[PDB]
Amino acid sequence: MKVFDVHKFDMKKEQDFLQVQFNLKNRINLSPTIHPDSINTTAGVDLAYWEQDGEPYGVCCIIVIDADTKEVIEKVHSMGRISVPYVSGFLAFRELPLIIEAAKKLETEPDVFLFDGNGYLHYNHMGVATHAAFFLGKPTIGIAKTYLKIKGCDFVTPEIEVGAYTDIIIDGEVYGRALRTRRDVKPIFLSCGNYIDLDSSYQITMSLINQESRLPIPVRLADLETHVLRTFYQKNH
């Protein structure tokens, strides 16, 4: 699908990256309410990396499923040498190029994109899920497997029950939630990406959860796809 040409990727020093984040950060809108049964499709995005001939590479997979049946309707991927981090703390910038490339290959138009990564739950509310939203022009959701501790703030462990959650609050603001997707197993960390409220992010995520993994269906499939493709390229180097 078509994507918005938000900005270029010519940033050099950390100052450049901060300026881009601060600009987009003021364009974040978490007011949209979106019911799970009102959408036609949901997409999952993930990225995998590996060492190769001395240079770092990455493969981004986007898995699109039918919202109602949860069946896979489209799969695309992008692959290329990832840019070596000349700065630190801006992973999203070195991932976006591959993400945009993959999204451009999409024949479908996903109504929402769930990312294997953070969104609003980020030091500057500018995690990959949120950042990618501007380019995609679509609502996005952040699904993180690990907790990013901000301002020295720790989260409250959610109940053992499925769907249980706790709000991660920093400076009196809700950054996201610690969510128990699969009972008793490690919870995931949910945050709005952009163009959607926490309630909807939560409802859509839970509607995509089955007792097989703690990651919503779309994201679990993308993750598995990025791993199989990476293994393919590695053994065929």
**Measured distance between the N- and C-terminal CA atoms of the chain, rounded to whole angstroms:** 30
Experimental structure resolution, Å? 2.1
CB of 167 closer than 8 Å to CB of 194 = no
CA 50 – CA 226 distance, rounded (Å): 11
CATH topology of domain 2-237: archaeoglobus fulgidus dsm 4304 fold (3.30.2170)
On whether 46 is known to bind a ligand per the annotation, the reply is yes
CA 212 – CA 219 distance, rounded (Å): 13
CB atoms within 10 A of CB 4: 11
Nearest to 227, CA basis, from 25, 59, 38: 59
Alpha carbon distance 166, 158 (integer Å): 6
Strands 72-81 and 55-66, by their bridges, are antiparallel
d(CA 232, CA 223) in angstroms, rounded, equals 14
- Residue 25: count of CB within 10 angstroms of its CB: 16
The helix/strand count (H/E) of the chain reads as 5, 8
Buried b (16+ CB within 10 A) or exposed e, 65-102: bebeeeeeebbbbbbeebeeeeeeebbbbbbbbbbbbb
Q: 197 among the known binding-site residues?
A: no
